[PDB]
Each structure stands twice: as C-alpha cells, then as structure tokens.
Amino acid sequence: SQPRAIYYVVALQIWEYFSFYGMRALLILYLTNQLKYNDTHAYELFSAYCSLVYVTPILGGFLADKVLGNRMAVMLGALLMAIGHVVLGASEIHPSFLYLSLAIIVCGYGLFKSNVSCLLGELYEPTDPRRDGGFSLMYAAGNVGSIIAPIACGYAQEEYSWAMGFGLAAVGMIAGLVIFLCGNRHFTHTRGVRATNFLLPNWGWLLVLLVATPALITILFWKEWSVYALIVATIIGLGVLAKIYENQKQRELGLIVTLTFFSMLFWAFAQQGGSSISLYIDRFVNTVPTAMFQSINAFAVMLCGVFLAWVVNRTVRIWGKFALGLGLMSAGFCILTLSARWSAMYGLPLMVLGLAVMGFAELFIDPVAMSQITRIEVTGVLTGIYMLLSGAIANYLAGVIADQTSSINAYIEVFDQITWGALACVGVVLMIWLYQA
Template sequence: MASILTKDSVTPGTPGTPGSQWTFFGHPFGLATLFMTEMWERFSYYGMRALLPLYLVAPGGLHMSAGTATAIYSVYLSLVYLLALPGGWFADRVLGPRKTVAVAGLVIMLGHITLALPGGSGVFFAGLGLVAIGSGLLKANISTMVGHLYDGPNDPRRDGGFTIFYIGINLGAFAAPLIIGTVGEKVSWHLGFGIAALGMALGLILFLVGRRTLSPDSDVVPTPLPAAERNSLLRKSALWAAVAAVFYAIVVGTGHYTLNWLIVPITVLGLIIPVLVIARIKRDKDLDAAEQSKMSAYIWFFVAAAVFWMIYDQGGSTLSLFAESSAENSVFGWEFPVSWYQSVNPVLIMALAPVFAWFWLALNRRGKEPSTIVKFGSGLVLVGVSFFLFLLPLSIAEGGHKAAALWLVAIYFCQTVGELTLSPVGLSVTTKMAPAKYASQMMGVWFLAVTAGDATTGLLSTAGVDLNGRGVVALQAALAVVAGVAVWMYRSKVKKMMGDVN
C-alpha cells in the first residue's frame, strides 16, 4: 500500500480529504476507502454469484432443475438492479449516501451469513433476499460518493478517479470465483458463502474506519423526506406488506404454493416497472421539446441494452450450467472448478479497457471515432456473435463429447469486447441525454435495462424454455444481431432525435 501513496499531490482542503495531505494515486485519500470497500463488496457479491447456479442444481445443494436455477439466478440479478432505484431514493430522502452504504454493507453481510447457515430453501432464499436488498442500497450510492470527492464534473482528476475505482470492482470480481468458488465447490458450499460474508465484513470495517476521509457531502441528505410524507409512506408500505403476507399465507395454507408464486410476480415486476418509469418521464409536461426528443431516442438505447444484458448475464447461469454438465473443465490436463469461468470477464476487462480507451482516443484525433449509435450497435452484434459461437460447443456436447474449455473462454471474450463497446457508452449517453429534472434518477433508469433483460431470461426459464437448447440460443443470437443492425440502419433518425448529443 505504501508504494501507491503520495503526499502533497492535491491542495489542502480538497473534498474528501479534510485536514489531510495524504492522497491515493494523486487522488483524494477517500478514494482509497471507497476502492477497498467496493473491492471487498464485489468480492463477496461475485463469489456468491459464481456459486449460486451451481449450488442450486447440485445434489449436495438444493438439487433443482437447470431451468429453475436459471430462473432464480436471473430474478436475483434483476432484483439487485431494480432495487438500485429505491436505493438511490432512500439515500436522497432519508439517510444520505454514507449512512446508506454502511447499512447496505451490514445487510449484505447478514445475507451472506444466512446463506452460510445449513438449512432448507427458506433460509437460503431469505439470505439471497438480504444480499439483493443490500446490493441495491449500495450500488446506487457508493459511486455517488466517489463523485463527491472531486470539485464538480469539471475536475480533471474525476475520470481518472472513477477508472481507479472501476479497477477495484474488477479486482474483487476476479479474485472471488478463484477463492470462494474453489472453497464452495471443493470443500463446502456453505463455507464458500461464509467466506463471502467475511469479504463483506472486511469491506464494511474498512469503510467505517475510513469514513473521515470521505467528503462531508456524503453525509448530507439532499432532499429530506418531510415528516408527514414519511409517515404516509410508512403506512402505505406496512399496508402493502400486510396484503402480501396475508396473500402468501393463504396460498401456503391451502397447499397451492410453489416456487413460481414467488418467481413469477418478481419477474413480471422486473418487466413492468422499467416500462412505467420511462413512460412516466415521457409523459412529464415539464420537459421541453428537446428533452422529449432525447427521451424518445433514449428508448432505442434502453431496449437495445435490455437485449444485450439478457444474453450477457447468462454467462453466469446458462453458460455456467453448460460448463458444469457438458464441458471439459481442464487446461493441459489440469482440472479447475466451474466457478473459475466467472473470473474470465473481469481479467479481460482489466486487460482490454485501457486498450479501448486508447483506441477511441486515437480514432478521435483522426476524426474517425465511431458515433455512440455505431458503438452501441457493435456491442449488440458482438453479444449475438458470442451466442452463435455457443452453438458450436452445444453441437459437440450433443454428439456425446465434452466441449473444450477454450470454447467458453472465446464466448466470454466476445461478450467482454461487446461490454466494453456498449456499457461505458450507455452510461455516458444516459448522463448526456437525461432531462435536467431527472438528472439524478437516470442512472437508475439505465440499471432498469439490466432488470428488464434479466427478468426476460427469468420469465423464459419459468415458462420451461430450455435456454441451453440450440434453437433458443440461435434465436437469441439472431435477435441481438438484428437489434444491432436495426440501431445502425436507423442511426440517422436516432441521431436527429438526440439533438446536440454525440
């Protein structure tokens, strides 16, 4: 750690470093606190996520079908991103970002501890729910606190700070499957989940110890909830909770309860809520003509992103379950746990992100950088190509042979290149096209695209669709490629609606 610390790189009084001259790679030292917090939180999250579908189907786990496991995995991911929206609202109106992140860390840790406890599916799903709630609370707010460390959006260090923070995310995501996955698969599932709890505990401790290095803005509740509105919200929440409790008590008491009674409503909400949120913004009469036009253009990006994430996030479910049953998970005769595949994406991200940043800048200097629309369409085509590539190992497996591990690595490579083409662009275009009235909420709207994509996967799995079937894989691949080509073909129309946004 000492080798990455400098002194006097920023002026005294820099936001996030009250009374301190220490910096982190020339950035406010609060970035070190948030870097380590996020790294350990991602370690716990991605470690648990790598184990989740494997535990659900394992004879020593919950021994479910592959379809049910995929549905649960997809619903869980959609919930995490869906809850990011109320997570941001909770910080804005109730606790402020810093206290919300502290609460989120505690909830996530308790969730992992619950997952580590031996017990039936009820205990396991309770733990999964706690992790989803905590992740939603944290995801929306820790990035906000990174922004608080700098002197506004024009601070020249801001982009570099987020880049360093992004490295922390991928370091945690890379290490988690190697450690938690190995212990979970080879020693004990519950011990693996326990190590995830330990990772979150370390992140929470580092956050609490380093809280004084954060900006005072992170303690501020931007728009506090008035007492009357708070009481009304509590009454309504209690009423809906009571209605849900009574409904499910009746379903269970009459012997009609199955897992679908839980999965289907959540999946449907994951599809309906994104549509309602965007429709509400579009109907807002306070938006001027330019803002309305940009929101019309944004719908194109939103739908395309939902298609992208629908396929991309199956890397942790459909592909993982295929690897568990039908792949030769070895290199030069050395076998490795299936969960290790989940480390491929983060290591590729860390290796390729600087290359992409340099490449776009080099093209920009020559006046040849592709437009936002072309980059977006390329990401969709690439994720479609990854599933066309998936057809080859599927054919090998159908012939009674085990598919080589490098086939899966090649699929993850295509998806990662697609992610680097689409995801940063999507984040950027979201902030650029956001109406002024919804500037702070639009990032939550972007997360809803992930929710919609994962909810679609969950709904297909619940309906009994075999996502490892060659026809279904080919259909999804074709959908992504067609969507990418459509975005490219209508680029002039979308560009016109985007106005002054490039």
C-alpha cells in the same frame, strides 16, 4: 497520490464486488446442485435475484439522497449485504433462509450501489483532476475484484464445501466493511428527519427496512409474484417516461428509448449467458471447473477495457458502438454455439472464447446509453428508468431465455438462435444509424 477516503472507497469496492460476484458465481450452480431444485425453478430464482438487484437502488439509493446521507446508507448497505451473505451460508435449513438471505442482500445492494457512487461523488470539489483517476480506480478496482472473486469462491467450494464459499463471500464483505468503517474523513452528513410526514419518525424507517425485506423475501419465495412486481415497477417507469415526454423542441429522447431497448435485448443475452452457460458448463466439458468461468467474463472485460482507454458526433459514435456490442454478443454466441456442437455432435475452450467475446462487447455497449443520458436535453432520473428497463427487464428476460433452454440439443437451439437474433439486433442498428449518416 490521491486523498485518504479514496483508497478506502476503492478497497470497499474491491471487497464488495468480490463478495457479490463470487456468490452470484456460485448461485445458479448451488441452486441446481445442492438444493433439491430443478433447472427451471433455479432459473426463476436466480433471474429474480439479478433483476431485483437492478431494481432496489432506485428507492434504496434514494434513501441516502433525502433523509439518510451517503455516509450511513453505504455502511447500512454493506451491513445488510454482509448479514445477507452470512444467512446465505445457513440456507440449507428450510426454504426460508434462502429468500431471507437473498432479500437482505438485494436490500443491501439496493442501498450500496448508487449510494457509494454518490458518496465518492461527495469527496472531491469541482476542481480536482484526481476525481477522474479515482472513479477510474473505481472501474478498475471493482473489475479486479470481479476477476478475482469467482476463482476465490470457486476453489473455496469444491475442495472444502459450499459453506466455505458463501462464507468467504460474507468474509470478503466483512473485510471490506472493516476497511471502510475503520476511521473517518468521509462526509455527506446523514440527518434532518423531526417526526411525522404522516406518522413518519424512525418507526417509518424501521418499518421500511424490515418490511422491504419480506416484501422481497416472499417475492423470491412465491416467485410468481417476482415477475409481477417488475410489471408494477414497469408501468411506473413507463408512465413516468411518458410524463417526461415536456416540450423543449427537439427531444434525442425516443432514440434513447431505442437505446434502452437494444441494450435491454443485449443484457437479456448477457445475463442468460451467465446462468445458462453456468449450468451448461459442468454438464458438457471437453484445477477447478464450473463457477470459475465468470472470471473469464470479467477478465475479457478487463482486457478489452485496458485496450479501450488505451486507444483514444452523436451519429457515427452510437452507430458503431451499438452495432459492435451487439455484433460481438452475436459472434460470441456463434463461436459458443459451435463450441457446444463441435465439442459433442461431431468431434471445448472455444466456449471460453465465446464468453471472452461476450465480455469483449460488454465493454463496448452501455457507456453510450449512459453518456447519452447525462447529456440529455432530469438526468439522474433518466438513468434510473434506464437502469430499470435495461437492468431489470433484461435480467428477467435472461431468466425466460434460460427457461426456454431447460439436452445439448436444446442448449445448442437457444445459443444458435440467440446468435442469429443478437445479429438481427446488430443489423437493425447498423441500418438505423447508417440511415442517420
């Protein structure tokens, strides 16, 4: 019972999410298994990917805020992502096509994330009730594609080849793109730039897309450089946060810093969960295995979300929310660590449980880091810095935790340790807002 363009953006979200998360499902697995790549190199690449995927939407999603509009930069984000996924099928020739494909998709996603959010944002007026139902349709559609994808790319891989899998990701994105580009009625009117800021006609934008691509290619390629470009972006975000420290009297600011810190540690555990458990899985297992477990992440998230919207102070709220998210990440890793050491050491689906509780909490925290940002004291920037630290830094940290994993005894080492550590985060949170009350 919504407008036309909403069904469109919904379908494009389901197919884009399908593609991306199916690929990222196969990513670390493929990377170790048919590569020639050892564990740690694969961890640095995968990490690098996930992390930059969280970085580019800043500069990328802005390209549609200023010169391009939210019509063009989404179809561009989607084209970049499609071609990236396709070149990512041909990756088996040379250590080129890999970083090529990955940079094309980091660029594409870089556009598409914030561009599609702002694009749906440009449809409804500040009257429509159906606005919220459309964004919750974005939630649910995206997450449905999230449970569907790794089982689709999964059953596509092993009974055919990695080719059919990654090309199924590409094909999914292609169908999402066909679905979007078919027709009209979308808006945001991309225009306005005619030639030079400093020598900056279209040549500047060609240069921007092209050159952004190998700037990303060799960063995943050298991968030493990978770590450092974040450190660049990091001194940037921190210097800016520091600038944000206008007067205004009272400023939830530093306690939002507190937020983005605890959510950073959180996402380190969550993403590293994704990769380390992705490899751990096929190596120790008590119909297809492997990459289809990211589907139980997505599915636990959907269960918990369905029950969340089914259920319904800046003190009691944030207290409980963060302490519960952290608490269940920890518990998930306790049940997971005891899944590994019970499956083996003295004799597992309880690992499925561990993941399910990891999603179970994923639900719980970071609406609150995001609610608190929109509610601040401008707003759109704060969530950029947040997405930087929390998204990026936590994905590279996820990568490091992974490095420090790479047998079953080491895996158990890191899982147990991050259970007591996630729990340390919980405790500190509990203490904090208990003392707030």
